[PDB]
């Protein structure tokens, strides 16, 4: 009655904090907005967060709900 | 499943068609969508819900 | 026999039984039958021990069963190969660690609590001890 | 505007006298009057709800808003978003004109009129009553009725307690058995 599972989707954080990125680089492939988009970060259609400018990855905690933003410092 | 495939043909003289799917049963009316025609390079009305 | 009225999933993994216990003080009553050995306790052993206590200190007193089974143990039948699924839920155990007060008792003298807890600790598989209600 | 002027002098003055308010604005005022006609027998017929809507259109001076079902429940054979009642929210000038016709000529034309119940407050001053006939309003033609259709009135006011609503409504003499 069992014996099935899907293929593993390889989510998670692809570039960590302080890690230098190019523009276009995917930072967190994820499933809802567990991590939100910050400065110079875009959120794709499947809530993939990608580097919209070059620089360094900056994980932060902002706002009244303590959300986890991801900025990019210009570098 | 039930939902059929149709060709939205261009109202200009070209043969260019978009293609899509329609529920033929619940929506028997034809489907007119002002889509983009790349041979004319202009947004023309498209017809023909097959 | 004790068993949860309605589970959420029928079969549980084995998992392990490590570390010390949480229920450690005699909370509700005045005298307590506290575990020392590790082990696990089926619902039949809890019922057997409770009947030994309830008989022993007659229908006076008040007895609290501080542990509850809520863990289903599956067995495979006889002359069945390995594989072909997980077994069937046969009984239900509580996992015990050193420190669990398994039972409490109040409304008797201490010497009857010694007597009922001796009578009922011989129906359990774990080494057991007698404790009192200490104040802080 | 007759009972609105009557409010603005004698009910404001009278309630400032009775209760020992400080502010002139702390006095209760009637916010709105909602007329509901929850028909329910329109699960099979649409013209029945249309006639209900014509009756609330006559009793107030406004089109009613045909209300839909919030949840689906099977106890009454309805479904989500199915139109099942109609209401009119009267406020402003038309609230006072309807309130004048109501306590003046509509309430006395009730069959076997004993009085309106004083324990029909919802704890916050807001009155709510029910009429059993639409005939008791002088606009509804008695020769043109098809179904007897009562309705429920709800006076919503800005009083905090319900004794304060006893006082407000009772200052319009508003029968109260």
């Amino acid at each position: 009655r069992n014996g099935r599972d899907s293929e593993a989707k390889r989510l998670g954080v692809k570039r960590f904090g302080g890690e230098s990125v190019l523009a276009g680089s995917i930072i967190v492939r994820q499933r809802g907005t567990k991590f939100h988009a910050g400065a110079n970060v875009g959120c794709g259609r499947d809530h993939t967060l990608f580097a919209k400018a070059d620089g360094k990855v900056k994980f932060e905690v902002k706002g009244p709900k303590n959300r986890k933003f991801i900025s990019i410092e210009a570098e | 499943g039930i939902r059929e495939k149709i060709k939205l043909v261009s109202s200009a003289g070209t043969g260019h068609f978009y293609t899509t799917t329609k529920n033929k049963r619940t929506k028997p009316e034809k489907l007119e969508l002002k889509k983009f025609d790349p041979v004319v390079r202009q947004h023309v009305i498209y017809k023909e819900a097959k | 026999m004790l068993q949860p009225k309605r589970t959420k999933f029928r079969k549980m993994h084995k998992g392990r039984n490590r570390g010390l216990a949480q229920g450690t003080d005699v909370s509700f009553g005045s005298f307590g039958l506290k575990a020392v050995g590790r082990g696990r306790l089926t619902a039949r052993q809890i019922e057997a021990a409770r009947r030994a206590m309830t008989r022993a200190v007659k229908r006076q007193g008040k007895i609290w069963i501080r542990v509850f089974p809520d863990k289903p143990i599956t067995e495979k039948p006889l002359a069945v190969r390995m594989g072909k699924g997980k077994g069937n839920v046969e009984y239900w155990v509580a996992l015990i660690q050193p420190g669990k007060v398994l039972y409490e008792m109040d409304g008797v003298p201490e010497e009857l609590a010694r007597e009922a807890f001796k009578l009922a600790a011989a129906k359990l598989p774990i080494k057991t001890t007698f404790v009192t209600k200490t104040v802080m | 505007a007759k009972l609105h002027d009557y409010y603005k002098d004698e009910v404001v003055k009278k309630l400032m006298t009775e209760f020992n308010y400080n502010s002139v604005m702390q006095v209760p005022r009637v916010e709105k009057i909602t007329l509901n006609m929850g028909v329910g027998e329109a699960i099979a017929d649409k013209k029945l709800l249309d006639n209900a809507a014509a009756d609330l259109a006559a009793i107030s001076g406004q089109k009613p808003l045909i209300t839909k079902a919030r949840k689906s429940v099977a106890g009454f054979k309805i479904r989500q978003g199915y139109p099942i009642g109609c209401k009119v929210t009267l406020r402003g000038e038309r609230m006072w004109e309807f309130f004048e016709r109501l306590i003046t000529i509509a309430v006395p034309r009730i069959r076997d009129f004993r009085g309106l119940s004083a324990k029909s407050f919802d704890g916050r001053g807001n009155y709510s009553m029910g009429v059993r006939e639409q005939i008791i309003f002088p606009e509804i033609d008695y020769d043109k009725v098809d179904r007897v259709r009562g309705l429920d009135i709800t006076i919503t006011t800005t009083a905090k307690s319900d004794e304060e609503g006893r006082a407000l409504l009772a200052a319009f003499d508003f029968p109260f058995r």
């Binding site: - | - | - | 259109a57 006559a58 001076g61 406004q62 089109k63 038309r94 004109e97 004048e100 016709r101 306590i103 003046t104 000529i105 309430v107 006395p108 034309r109 009129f113 004993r114 009085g115 002088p138 606009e139 003499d173 029968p175 058995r177």
Partner: protein, 55 residues
Amino acid sequence: MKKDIHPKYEEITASCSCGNVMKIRSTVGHDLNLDVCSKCHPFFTGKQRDVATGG
């Protein structure tokens, strides 16, 4: 209010048998004859004859 979706709500004059001539706005579109008004309705005499039964 909106435009003409509402019924015509014109001021009329009601008059009952109590001598109470009273002009009001009502969407009847016709002058009115009544019997009972708020003035001179048997409400208090009604309550008295209600209570006055036993013996």
